[PDB]
Design a protein around this ligand. Structure first.
Ligand SMILES: [Zn+2]
Ligand SMILES: [Zn+2]
Ligand SMILES: [Zn+2]
Ligand SMILES: [Zn+2]
Lengths: 76, 78
DNA sequence: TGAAGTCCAAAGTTCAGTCCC
DNA sequence: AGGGACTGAACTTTGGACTTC
């Protein structure tokens, strides 16, 4: 099973979508800090294993596209 | 532990070797900008906390000899 | 046990001081 | 004078290892 966000190896369902440990942590931290970030390009950046850290905005957007929900992220 | 490159205090393992923040930073920049340093002397310069900035060629050479890996340096990001 | 959570080593970024073109 | 480059410390983000409900 591959990560629905970046294509890396998936470790199971996280926050509503199958994803790797990276996209898992990235999403949780983003939601808890209520970050939306911003893209400096056309908000259509390539989010794969190698470039996932190049644009937080696009990575986060794809997490939501993949099915992740803020609702699934807990406080603390 | 100490920096395997210059002897200064090590802040942990960096790019594969125990090193300080100075050598950590130096290696990263050297790799990302693919700088081709040269040595004015015999390429046997002593690299310590004191002289580390005297010869970039030898400090980089020491970095690789100490275990730092080019592959461990990631691409710059925002 | 599934899917939340936490921990933390090792990546990354910014920038003041300082000097060269 | 404006443009550019380097160093290393302060501080943040990443993601794999492990823990709780
Ligand atoms: Zn992923
Ligand atoms: Zn983008
Ligand atoms: Zn050092
Ligand atoms: Zn030298």
């Amino acid at each position: 099973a591959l990560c629905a966000i970046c294509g890396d190896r998936a470790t199971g369902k996280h926050y509503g979508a199958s994803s790797c440990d990276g996209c898992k942590g990235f999403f949780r931290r983003s939601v808890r800090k209520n970050h939306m970030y911003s893209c400096r390009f056309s908000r259509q950046c390539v989010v794969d294993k190698d470039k996932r850290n190049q644009c937080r905005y696009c990575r986060l957007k794809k997490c939501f596209r993949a099915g992740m929900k803020k609702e699934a992220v807990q406080n603390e």
